[PDB]
Design a protein around this ligand. Structure first.
Ligand SMILES: Cc1cncc(-c2cnc(N[C@@H]3C[C@H]4CC[C@H](N4)[C@H]3CCC3CCC(F)(F)CC3)c3[nH]c(=O)c(C)cc23)c1
Length: 123
């Protein structure tokens, strides 16, 4: 396994915005507690789950645990950085797996919910 993505940098500028608060308090919260969330709550442990090629295929890993930490630590300046990380998580699943796979259908359901919440992103 690689080390997890960076989640904290004290030398980055910090700002609180309505969009970033919403992403943490509404979007991430809602996806976290979704019935199909558990495979996406932490980095893929390719050693433990016997997926030796996962990090040969996925060079930009992302998970909701990392996203939570990034939001909490004010790692993102722009809301789009956070939205991009969610999208990377979904696309990684689509990349590593095949169309119509069970995990892909779970990711598709989370993505659908994500887009419903993003629709209500504050201005
Ligand atoms: C509980 C959990 C935690 N962390 C990660 C995973 C996880 C497992 N397997 C993945 N892929 C595999 C690759 C091949 C082989 C079998 C099948 N095709 C596929 C299994 C999918 C199921 C595994 C058990 C389950 F309960 F989680 C439901 C899905 C994974 N692929 C991924 O892309 C991610 C993000 C996790 C993952 C699961």
């Amino acid at each position: 396994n690689p080390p997890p993505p960076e989640t904290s940098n004290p030398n980055k500028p910090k700002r609180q915005t309505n969009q970033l608060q919403y992403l943490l308090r509404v979007v991430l919260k809602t996806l976290w507690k979704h019935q199909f969330a558990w495979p996406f709550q932490q980095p893929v442990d390719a050693v433990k789950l016997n997926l030796p090629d996962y990090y040969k295929i996925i060079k930009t890993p992302m998970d909701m645990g990392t996203i939570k930490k990034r939001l909490e630590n004010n790692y993102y300046w722009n809301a789009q950085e956070c939205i991009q990380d969610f999208n990377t998580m979904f696309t990684n699943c689509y990349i590593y797996n095949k169309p119509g796979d069970d995990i892909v259908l779970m990711a598709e359901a989370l993505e659908k919910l994500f887009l419903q919440k993003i629709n209500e992103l504050p201005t």
